[PDB]
Design a protein around this ligand. Sequence first.
Ligand code: ZN
Length: 221
Amino acid sequence: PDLKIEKLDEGVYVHTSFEEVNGWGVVPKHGLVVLVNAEAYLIDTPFTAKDTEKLVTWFVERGYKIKGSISSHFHSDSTGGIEWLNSRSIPTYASELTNELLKKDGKVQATNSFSGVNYWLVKNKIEVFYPGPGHTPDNVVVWLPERKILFGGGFIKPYGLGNLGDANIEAWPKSAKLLKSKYGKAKLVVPSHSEVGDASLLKLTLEQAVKGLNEHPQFEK
Ligand SMILES: [Zn+2]
């Protein structure tokens, strides 16, 4: 299924790429393209080199140069395009924790890394926030202050925590509480697979996290 690009707000697009899960079916993965000063920043990179190339070239050829990409966590649904981006010397970014996990997993790393609670990828325009470990030990979210849009990625799991292989279920509630207190002001929250929502996704996630500690989508009901 082809890469999709849909307008979310002025200068904010959702890119949707797709992975086949053999024992289930096809799953959508959302990232963003954010336009700042007629220049493009990737928020998460499509699974494959081919879709990353397609996305990038799509913007570049029409006059919006790719300035960089930020990957929100180490899973390939967020980092699959880092190889291609690096091969073209397009700046790639990910936290130190994310790069360390990529290194351990024998994956190509972002060329640029950062640490701390807040990192401004683009001053006043694109902020990276680390709420603490959750869906993965390294997960971060990306805040766009001008549109009040939060890309939550894999941390935002409003309707089920999903793959717990790499999750920190002990810390996830505290992290989710922090995120919720931090970005209750968001107008839109963008999860990796679930539908774009409002700030209510922050609370649902918390609930999930909590319930989880008490111990693809699942459509059976
Ligand atoms: Zn993940």
